[PDB]
Amino acid sequence: NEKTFDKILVANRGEIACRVIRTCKKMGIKTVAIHSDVDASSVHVKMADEAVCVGPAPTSKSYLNMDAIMEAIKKTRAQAVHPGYGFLSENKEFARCLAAEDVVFIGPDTHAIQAMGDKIESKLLAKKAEVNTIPGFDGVVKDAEEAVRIAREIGYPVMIKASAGGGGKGMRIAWDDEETRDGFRLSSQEAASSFGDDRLLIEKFIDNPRHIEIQVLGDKHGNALWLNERECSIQRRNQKVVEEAPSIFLDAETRRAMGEQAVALARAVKYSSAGTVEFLVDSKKNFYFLEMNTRLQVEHPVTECITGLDLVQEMIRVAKGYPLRHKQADIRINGWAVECRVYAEDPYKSFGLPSIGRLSQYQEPLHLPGVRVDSGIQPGSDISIYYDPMISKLITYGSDRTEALKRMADALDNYVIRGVTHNIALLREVIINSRFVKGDISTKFLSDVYPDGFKGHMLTKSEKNQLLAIASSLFVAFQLRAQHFQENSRMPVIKPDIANWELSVKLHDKVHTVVASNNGSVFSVEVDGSKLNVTSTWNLASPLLSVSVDGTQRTVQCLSREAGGNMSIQFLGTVYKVNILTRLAAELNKFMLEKVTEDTSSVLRSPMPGVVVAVSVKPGDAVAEGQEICVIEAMKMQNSMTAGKTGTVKSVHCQAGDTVGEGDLLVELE
Amino acid sequence: LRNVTASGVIPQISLIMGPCAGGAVYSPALTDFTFMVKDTSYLFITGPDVVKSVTNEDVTQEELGGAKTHTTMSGVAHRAFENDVDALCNLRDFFNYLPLSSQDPAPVRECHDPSDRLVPELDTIVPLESTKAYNMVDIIHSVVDEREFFEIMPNYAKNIIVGFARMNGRTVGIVGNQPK
């Protein structure tokens, strides 16, 4: 019953495009979508009422090509454009073109975006709005009393730094005026002695710099509402992995003070849309303005769950110019929400490494309680090299923080992703980590908790026994099902009568003796002298298997198995490789000779004769496993050569237009 | 003679697990399937010494009749296995597929994969442009029960794919072109 734009064009790809389209259908607005060539069958294109191609696969030639989008808007008679996040959400030029063609842009004004875009002005505006100061000092610190004056203007704690040098020599934190006077004196002597340069700089310091941000909603009428804070401290490579709302650190007083200051800033710059004011919060709950995001953010859903509000619907209502229907007093914190963005990356390499491939199977755990999934992919989706690796946002909601964290852990164990590597193992380990559960978190959490690197979950003796029992039961179940042939009158089958299965199971370079028996659906397993019972339906085809080991419920996945005895099992979010043999087979295996096994995949060679159409890598470039290195044409089939493993290009031995032959070196990887 | 008399009556399987030279090599050739163990088995009518003496060629036993040679070049062997233990385990697995004789239908065993399961991942597997290839093995894995496929001659004449699988628990033979 509320008039709104009849049709909207969503200029984005991935989960955000789908999220916006769902709201538009909910509000009755017709939708149009823009896709590159590779995204022709993507969920957003299928979801949109109409779709228009805007160009070639590279983003610069497609999403960032405004001209193609502008022609599409004219062609579709698009009333309004929603830019989502990234791409052209903050591009001034696009808004001008929309204004020229009288197309509403769903977002804030260019001046508001530009003002926050400048770091120097943004601080002057923050000071004028009386938000917690974030001063920057271009000049040099002359003496210890000038240091104290500057430290009081910036606000404590402050960091004193040498102008010359690196590695943290001549750096000191000061919490008060006396620590500043000594910190300056000591750092100047250390810098003069170490570098021959006594010049010092003073900047604010943040103990445990938790990243806490306040969502804000603005209207043309000038009314503004603050949404509750969000903690986004957990991050890898400057990219956030886990986000939660509300923060477990903020009390009702601090949170309100942050909300009021964020709205004061939004009013000072006449903001007119949903946005986010980001703060650094220290261990004493002092908070300091970092930046004011002027776009719908990726972590918006956790706020939507606690508030009960649809941010996209509100952005559309504000764009029509309809006044806000809510007052700050109407904005409550209901329950707790946690978001864990899912990526196609190897958690074990670095903390994340881009991985590419076709999703051969994909199943979201929606059936589970308190679970909402924001994705832009489906089974058969091709995670491409050209775009961000985000598979989905996985969000869980609870009445309290514990319930939200538990439903998440359960959701991550129930999430099926096959055909790419993914970060679920890391996400699942963060969510159960005792520091994360206690709320002892900072922007350094991943480096502090995993200094050596991510090695996957570490099993406690009981967990190891449970995993071994489950693997043995699965092996025995497969062996038993192998004997269930249908009736053959000519030759009746004689059931192999076995009461106990004696198995040698190798988990991590250790060999465990297991004795497994079954009765109906109950398997009794003795592992190194410990007795366990495993119960389940033993459906060997379903991707997810639910079992009960001594009354403890577990969800396990069987990723692969071989007649030899190898088996890959996803347990507690980690993939373990076990090797199961019978006792006699294990004994006889001792006479087998260890093979050379030398097979270097670093060198990439031509499989068949042809002509090199193009080469996509140069020496020193980074190549992920499964990433194309070159394309070879023969009988007009455009054969594609893929990198054997993630690495760099030591040397490229091929050039475009060269007639290569079989068994010819093409590239070298480290 | 017995091999020839049994051809098409009862399945015959040969596993070469050691040296095998001279006329003895012909009996496995007459059987339905031949499997080889890597690095410890070989097949050739004449040994390397006679080859050197007659044709003045230098070759080792592995080069002349090794498992790799007969699984990638001559098209004589159907599969190569790492060890005796691995070979025997895979042999049991393979034997599970076959009927006992030509008087019996294809074996049907207990099945858990629903026969009406959808495979949405295939809706976009085939590229529109006829100049780009895909992997038919992915389609085969998607269609068959539990994504289980016992391939025959996986490393020989790779432009075609043949193997054994199960549909609704019933053994089936898969033949497919390989655009890759």
PDB file of N, CA and C in Angstrom, chain A residues 41 358-361 379-380 478 481-482 484-486 488 490-491 538-541 561 563-564 581 585 588-589 592-593 595 608 636-639, chain B residues 38-39 82-86 89-90 93 96 100-101 103-104 106-110 112-113 120-121 124-125 130-133 146-148 179-180:
ATOM      1  N   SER A  41      24.262 -17.421 -16.086  1.00  0.00           N
ATOM      2  CA  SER A  41      23.290 -18.344 -15.441  1.00  0.00           C
ATOM      3  C   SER A  41      23.329 -18.200 -13.920  1.00  0.00           C
ATOM      4  N   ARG A 358      34.574 -25.760  -9.948  1.00  0.00           N
ATOM      5  CA  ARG A 358      33.119 -25.897 -10.086  1.00  0.00           C
ATOM      6  C   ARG A 358      32.572 -26.559  -8.837  1.00  0.00           C
ATOM      7  N   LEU A 359      31.528 -25.979  -8.280  1.00  0.00           N
ATOM      8  CA  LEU A 359      30.834 -26.588  -7.152  1.00  0.00           C
ATOM      9  C   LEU A 359      30.061 -27.828  -7.610  1.00  0.00           C
ATOM     10  N   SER A 360      30.653 -29.018  -7.513  1.00  0.00           N
ATOM     11  CA  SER A 360      30.009 -30.268  -7.946  1.00  0.00           C
ATOM     12  C   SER A 360      28.812 -30.646  -7.071  1.00  0.00           C
ATOM     13  N   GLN A 361      28.829 -30.223  -5.807  1.00  0.00           N
ATOM     14  CA  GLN A 361      27.718 -30.347  -4.873  1.00  0.00           C
ATOM     15  C   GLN A 361      27.784 -29.214  -3.850  1.00  0.00           C
ATOM     16  N   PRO A 379      24.447 -25.230  -6.883  1.00  0.00           N
ATOM     17  CA  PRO A 379      25.248 -26.350  -7.378  1.00  0.00           C
ATOM     18  C   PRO A 379      25.595 -26.098  -8.852  1.00  0.00           C
ATOM     19  N   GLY A 380      26.847 -26.328  -9.241  1.00  0.00           N
ATOM     20  CA  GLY A 380      27.287 -26.065 -10.620  1.00  0.00           C
ATOM     21  C   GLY A 380      27.831 -24.665 -10.807  1.00  0.00           C
ATOM     22  N   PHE A 478      30.481 -50.427   5.278  1.00  0.00           N
ATOM     23  CA  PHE A 478      30.690 -50.586   3.843  1.00  0.00           C
ATOM     24  C   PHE A 478      30.959 -52.043   3.494  1.00  0.00           C
ATOM     25  N   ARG A 481      27.635 -53.975   3.706  1.00  0.00           N
ATOM     26  CA  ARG A 481      26.736 -53.709   2.590  1.00  0.00           C
ATOM     27  C   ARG A 481      27.245 -54.352   1.313  1.00  0.00           C
ATOM     28  N   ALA A 482      28.561 -54.537   1.199  1.00  0.00           N
ATOM     29  CA  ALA A 482      29.099 -55.178   0.007  1.00  0.00           C
ATOM     30  C   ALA A 482      28.575 -56.596  -0.181  1.00  0.00           C
ATOM     31  N   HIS A 484      25.378 -57.704   0.374  1.00  0.00           N
ATOM     32  CA  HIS A 484      23.920 -57.783   0.285  1.00  0.00           C
ATOM     33  C   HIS A 484      23.495 -57.782  -1.181  1.00  0.00           C
ATOM     34  N   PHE A 485      23.674 -58.930  -1.823  1.00  0.00           N
ATOM     35  CA  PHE A 485      23.159 -59.137  -3.165  1.00  0.00           C
ATOM     36  C   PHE A 485      21.696 -59.561  -3.108  1.00  0.00           C
ATOM     37  N   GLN A 486      20.984 -59.335  -4.206  1.00  0.00           N
ATOM     38  CA  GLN A 486      19.616 -59.818  -4.267  1.00  0.00           C
ATOM     39  C   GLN A 486      19.605 -61.323  -4.516  1.00  0.00           C
ATOM     40  N   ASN A 488      19.577 -64.929  -5.811  1.00  0.00           N
ATOM     41  CA  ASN A 488      20.021 -65.624  -7.014  1.00  0.00           C
ATOM     42  C   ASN A 488      19.694 -67.098  -6.837  1.00  0.00           C
ATOM     43  N   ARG A 490      19.925 -69.669  -8.825  1.00  0.00           N
ATOM     44  CA  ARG A 490      20.898 -70.635  -9.326  1.00  0.00           C
ATOM     45  C   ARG A 490      22.020 -70.865  -8.322  1.00  0.00           C
ATOM     46  N   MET A 491      22.533 -69.795  -7.717  1.00  0.00           N
ATOM     47  CA  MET A 491      23.588 -69.888  -6.706  1.00  0.00           C
ATOM     48  C   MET A 491      23.241 -69.028  -5.502  1.00  0.00           C
ATOM     49  N   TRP A 538      23.319 -45.431   9.346  1.00  0.00           N
ATOM     50  CA  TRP A 538      24.334 -45.949   8.435  1.00  0.00           C
ATOM     51  C   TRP A 538      23.887 -45.849   6.979  1.00  0.00           C
ATOM     52  N   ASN A 539      23.250 -44.734   6.633  1.00  0.00           N
ATOM     53  CA  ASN A 539      22.959 -44.427   5.241  1.00  0.00           C
ATOM     54  C   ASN A 539      24.255 -44.005   4.558  1.00  0.00           C
ATOM     55  N   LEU A 540      24.797 -44.877   3.717  1.00  0.00           N
ATOM     56  CA  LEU A 540      26.116 -44.676   3.136  1.00  0.00           C
ATOM     57  C   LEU A 540      26.106 -43.766   1.917  1.00  0.00           C
ATOM     58  N   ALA A 541      24.941 -43.279   1.498  1.00  0.00           N
ATOM     59  CA  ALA A 541      24.851 -42.416   0.329  1.00  0.00           C
ATOM     60  C   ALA A 541      24.691 -40.945   0.675  1.00  0.00           C
ATOM     61  N   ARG A 561      36.754 -42.461  -0.304  1.00  0.00           N
ATOM     62  CA  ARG A 561      37.288 -43.717   0.198  1.00  0.00           C
ATOM     63  C   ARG A 561      37.773 -44.537  -0.982  1.00  0.00           C
ATOM     64  N   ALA A 563      39.324 -48.676  -2.244  1.00  0.00           N
ATOM     65  CA  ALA A 563      39.444 -50.091  -1.919  1.00  0.00           C
ATOM     66  C   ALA A 563      40.729 -50.384  -1.161  1.00  0.00           C
ATOM     67  N   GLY A 564      41.773 -49.585  -1.389  1.00  0.00           N
ATOM     68  CA  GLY A 564      43.025 -49.797  -0.684  1.00  0.00           C
ATOM     69  C   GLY A 564      42.899 -49.631   0.815  1.00  0.00           C
ATOM     70  N   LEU A 581      43.194 -51.050   7.408  1.00  0.00           N
ATOM     71  CA  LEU A 581      43.498 -52.359   6.857  1.00  0.00           C
ATOM     72  C   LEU A 581      43.029 -53.429   7.830  1.00  0.00           C
ATOM     73  N   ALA A 585      45.973 -58.144   6.525  1.00  0.00           N
ATOM     74  CA  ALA A 585      46.491 -57.269   5.481  1.00  0.00           C
ATOM     75  C   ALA A 585      47.577 -56.355   6.026  1.00  0.00           C
ATOM     76  N   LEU A 588      50.760 -58.444   6.382  1.00  0.00           N
ATOM     77  CA  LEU A 588      51.385 -58.715   5.093  1.00  0.00           C
ATOM     78  C   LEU A 588      51.949 -57.457   4.449  1.00  0.00           C
ATOM     79  N   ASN A 589      51.421 -56.283   4.791  1.00  0.00           N
ATOM     80  CA  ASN A 589      51.914 -55.047   4.201  1.00  0.00           C
ATOM     81  C   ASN A 589      53.363 -54.767   4.571  1.00  0.00           C
ATOM     82  N   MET A 592      55.977 -55.057   1.794  1.00  0.00           N
ATOM     83  CA  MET A 592      55.904 -54.183   0.633  1.00  0.00           C
ATOM     84  C   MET A 592      57.008 -53.139   0.684  1.00  0.00           C
ATOM     85  N   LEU A 593      57.642 -52.914  -0.462  1.00  0.00           N
ATOM     86  CA  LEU A 593      58.738 -51.962  -0.550  1.00  0.00           C
ATOM     87  C   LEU A 593      58.206 -50.548  -0.721  1.00  0.00           C
ATOM     88  N   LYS A 595      57.992 -47.067  -2.228  1.00  0.00           N
ATOM     89  CA  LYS A 595      58.279 -46.631  -3.584  1.00  0.00           C
ATOM     90  C   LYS A 595      58.964 -45.268  -3.581  1.00  0.00           C
ATOM     91  N   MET A 608      49.421 -32.110 -25.722  1.00  0.00           N
ATOM     92  CA  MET A 608      49.173 -32.485 -27.105  1.00  0.00           C
ATOM     93  C   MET A 608      49.727 -31.415 -28.031  1.00  0.00           C
ATOM     94  N   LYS A 636      40.705 -26.701 -33.344  1.00  0.00           N
ATOM     95  CA  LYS A 636      39.774 -25.681 -32.864  1.00  0.00           C
ATOM     96  C   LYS A 636      38.943 -26.193 -31.687  1.00  0.00           C
ATOM     97  N   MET A 637      39.636 -26.509 -30.456  1.00  0.00           N
ATOM     98  CA  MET A 637      39.046 -26.942 -29.197  1.00  0.00           C
ATOM     99  C   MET A 637      39.522 -26.121 -28.007  1.00  0.00           C
ATOM    100  N   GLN A 638      40.447 -25.184 -28.209  1.00  0.00           N
ATOM    101  CA  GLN A 638      40.869 -24.255 -27.163  1.00  0.00           C
ATOM    102  C   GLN A 638      41.197 -24.990 -25.864  1.00  0.00           C
ATOM    103  N   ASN A 639      42.132 -25.930 -25.952  1.00  0.00           N
ATOM    104  CA  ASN A 639      42.521 -26.692 -24.775  1.00  0.00           C
ATOM    105  C   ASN A 639      43.186 -25.784 -23.751  1.00  0.00           C
TER     106      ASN A 639
ATOM    107  N   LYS B  38      52.625 -52.679 -10.274  1.00  0.00           N
ATOM    108  CA  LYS B  38      53.704 -51.808 -10.715  1.00  0.00           C
ATOM    109  C   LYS B  38      55.054 -52.282 -10.191  1.00  0.00           C
ATOM    110  N   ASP B  39      56.056 -52.247 -11.068  1.00  0.00           N
ATOM    111  CA  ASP B  39      57.456 -52.382 -10.681  1.00  0.00           C
ATOM    112  C   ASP B  39      57.867 -53.809 -10.343  1.00  0.00           C
ATOM    113  N   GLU B  82      49.574 -50.403  -7.123  1.00  0.00           N
ATOM    114  CA  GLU B  82      50.833 -50.074  -6.464  1.00  0.00           C
ATOM    115  C   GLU B  82      51.491 -51.303  -5.854  1.00  0.00           C
ATOM    116  N   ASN B  83      50.713 -52.151  -5.190  1.00  0.00           N
ATOM    117  CA  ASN B  83      51.261 -53.249  -4.409  1.00  0.00           C
ATOM    118  C   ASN B  83      50.415 -54.492  -4.613  1.00  0.00           C
ATOM    119  N   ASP B  84      50.914 -55.612  -4.091  1.00  0.00           N
ATOM    120  CA  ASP B  84      50.109 -56.827  -4.060  1.00  0.00           C
ATOM    121  C   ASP B  84      48.872 -56.638  -3.196  1.00  0.00           C
ATOM    122  N   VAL B  85      49.028 -55.996  -2.037  1.00  0.00           N
ATOM    123  CA  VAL B  85      47.896 -55.790  -1.140  1.00  0.00           C
ATOM    124  C   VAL B  85      46.865 -54.873  -1.785  1.00  0.00           C
ATOM    125  N   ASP B  86      47.323 -53.744  -2.323  1.00  0.00           N
ATOM    126  CA  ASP B  86      46.420 -52.823  -3.001  1.00  0.00           C
ATOM    127  C   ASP B  86      45.751 -53.495  -4.189  1.00  0.00           C
ATOM    128  N   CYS B  89      43.015 -55.918  -2.904  1.00  0.00           N
ATOM    129  CA  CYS B  89      41.834 -55.204  -2.431  1.00  0.00           C
ATOM    130  C   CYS B  89      41.010 -54.686  -3.604  1.00  0.00           C
ATOM    131  N   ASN B  90      41.675 -54.051  -4.570  1.00  0.00           N
ATOM    132  CA  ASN B  90      40.956 -53.559  -5.735  1.00  0.00           C
ATOM    133  C   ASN B  90      40.358 -54.702  -6.541  1.00  0.00           C
ATOM    134  N   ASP B  93      37.127 -55.584  -4.896  1.00  0.00           N
ATOM    135  CA  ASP B  93      36.157 -54.548  -5.231  1.00  0.00           C
ATOM    136  C   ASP B  93      35.619 -54.738  -6.642  1.00  0.00           C
ATOM    137  N   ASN B  96      33.251 -57.634  -7.175  1.00  0.00           N
ATOM    138  CA  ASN B  96      31.892 -57.419  -6.682  1.00  0.00           C
ATOM    139  C   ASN B  96      30.928 -57.040  -7.803  1.00  0.00           C
ATOM    140  N   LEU B 100      28.180 -64.081 -11.873  1.00  0.00           N
ATOM    141  CA  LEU B 100      28.954 -65.310 -11.760  1.00  0.00           C
ATOM    142  C   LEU B 100      29.068 -66.049 -13.086  1.00  0.00           C
ATOM    143  N   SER B 101      28.071 -65.934 -13.956  1.00  0.00           N
ATOM    144  CA  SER B 101      28.109 -66.591 -15.256  1.00  0.00           C
ATOM    145  C   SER B 101      27.157 -65.859 -16.189  1.00  0.00           C
ATOM    146  N   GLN B 103      24.590 -67.044 -17.462  1.00  0.00           N
ATOM    147  CA  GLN B 103      23.213 -67.429 -17.192  1.00  0.00           C
ATOM    148  C   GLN B 103      22.541 -66.536 -16.163  1.00  0.00           C
ATOM    149  N   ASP B 104      23.281 -65.639 -15.526  1.00  0.00           N
ATOM    150  CA  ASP B 104      22.729 -64.805 -14.479  1.00  0.00           C
ATOM    151  C   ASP B 104      22.588 -63.364 -14.951  1.00  0.00           C
ATOM    152  N   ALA B 106      22.606 -59.107 -14.421  1.00  0.00           N
ATOM    153  CA  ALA B 106      23.566 -58.211 -13.798  1.00  0.00           C
ATOM    154  C   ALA B 106      23.322 -58.162 -12.294  1.00  0.00           C
ATOM    155  N   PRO B 107      24.369 -58.244 -11.478  1.00  0.00           N
ATOM    156  CA  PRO B 107      24.167 -58.226 -10.025  1.00  0.00           C
ATOM    157  C   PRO B 107      23.472 -56.949  -9.578  1.00  0.00           C
ATOM    158  N   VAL B 108      22.572 -57.097  -8.610  1.00  0.00           N
ATOM    159  CA  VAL B 108      21.871 -55.976  -7.996  1.00  0.00           C
ATOM    160  C   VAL B 108      22.060 -56.085  -6.494  1.00  0.00           C
ATOM    161  N   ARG B 109      22.622 -55.050  -5.888  1.00  0.00           N
ATOM    162  CA  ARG B 109      22.896 -55.040  -4.463  1.00  0.00           C
ATOM    163  C   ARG B 109      22.094 -53.934  -3.784  1.00  0.00           C
ATOM    164  N   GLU B 110      22.166 -53.914  -2.459  1.00  0.00           N
ATOM    165  CA  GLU B 110      21.443 -52.924  -1.677  1.00  0.00           C
ATOM    166  C   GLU B 110      21.927 -51.521  -2.022  1.00  0.00           C
ATOM    167  N   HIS B 112      21.426 -47.194  -1.416  1.00  0.00           N
ATOM    168  CA  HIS B 112      20.939 -46.101  -0.587  1.00  0.00           C
ATOM    169  C   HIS B 112      20.729 -44.806  -1.352  1.00  0.00           C
ATOM    170  N   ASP B 113      21.405 -44.621  -2.476  1.00  0.00           N
ATOM    171  CA  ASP B 113      21.244 -43.410  -3.267  1.00  0.00           C
ATOM    172  C   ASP B 113      19.875 -43.409  -3.931  1.00  0.00           C
ATOM    173  N   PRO B 120      21.405 -30.913 -10.228  1.00  0.00           N
ATOM    174  CA  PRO B 120      21.380 -29.561 -10.802  1.00  0.00           C
ATOM    175  C   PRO B 120      22.726 -29.099 -11.321  1.00  0.00           C
ATOM    176  N   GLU B 121      23.826 -29.665 -10.828  1.00  0.00           N
ATOM    177  CA  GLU B 121      25.148 -29.227 -11.252  1.00  0.00           C
ATOM    178  C   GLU B 121      25.409 -29.477 -12.730  1.00  0.00           C
ATOM    179  N   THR B 124      24.664 -26.561 -16.272  1.00  0.00           N
ATOM    180  CA  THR B 124      25.569 -25.609 -16.906  1.00  0.00           C
ATOM    181  C   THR B 124      26.954 -26.200 -17.135  1.00  0.00           C
ATOM    182  N   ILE B 125      27.086 -27.525 -17.079  1.00  0.00           N
ATOM    183  CA  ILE B 125      28.397 -28.142 -17.236  1.00  0.00           C
ATOM    184  C   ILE B 125      28.917 -27.975 -18.659  1.00  0.00           C
ATOM    185  N   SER B 130      31.277 -24.072 -28.656  1.00  0.00           N
ATOM    186  CA  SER B 130      31.771 -25.401 -28.991  1.00  0.00           C
ATOM    187  C   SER B 130      33.287 -25.487 -29.017  1.00  0.00           C
ATOM    188  N   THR B 131      33.994 -24.400 -28.732  1.00  0.00           N
ATOM    189  CA  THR B 131      35.450 -24.405 -28.722  1.00  0.00           C
ATOM    190  C   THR B 131      36.038 -24.629 -27.336  1.00  0.00           C
ATOM    191  N   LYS B 132      35.209 -24.859 -26.323  1.00  0.00           N
ATOM    192  CA  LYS B 132      35.678 -25.118 -24.971  1.00  0.00           C
ATOM    193  C   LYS B 132      35.279 -26.521 -24.543  1.00  0.00           C
ATOM    194  N   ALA B 133      36.194 -27.205 -23.870  1.00  0.00           N
ATOM    195  CA  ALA B 133      35.990 -28.581 -23.449  1.00  0.00           C
ATOM    196  C   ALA B 133      35.560 -28.647 -21.989  1.00  0.00           C
ATOM    197  N   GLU B 146      26.276 -42.909  -5.674  1.00  0.00           N
ATOM    198  CA  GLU B 146      27.324 -42.565  -4.719  1.00  0.00           C
ATOM    199  C   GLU B 146      28.582 -42.031  -5.391  1.00  0.00           C
ATOM    200  N   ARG B 147      28.487 -41.615  -6.651  1.00  0.00           N
ATOM    201  CA  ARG B 147      29.624 -41.039  -7.363  1.00  0.00           C
ATOM    202  C   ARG B 147      30.787 -42.021  -7.458  1.00  0.00           C
ATOM    203  N   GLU B 148      30.487 -43.314  -7.483  1.00  0.00           N
ATOM    204  CA  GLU B 148      31.504 -44.354  -7.516  1.00  0.00           C
ATOM    205  C   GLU B 148      31.629 -44.900  -8.930  1.00  0.00           C
ATOM    206  N   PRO B 179      35.665 -34.963 -24.301  1.00  0.00           N
ATOM    207  CA  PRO B 179      36.074 -33.756 -25.033  1.00  0.00           C
ATOM    208  C   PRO B 179      37.360 -33.154 -24.516  1.00  0.00           C
ATOM    209  N   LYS B 180      37.740 -33.456 -23.274  1.00  0.00           N
ATOM    210  CA  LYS B 180      38.937 -32.880 -22.684  1.00  0.00           C
ATOM    211  C   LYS B 180      40.215 -33.351 -23.365  1.00  0.00           C
TER     212      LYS B 180
END
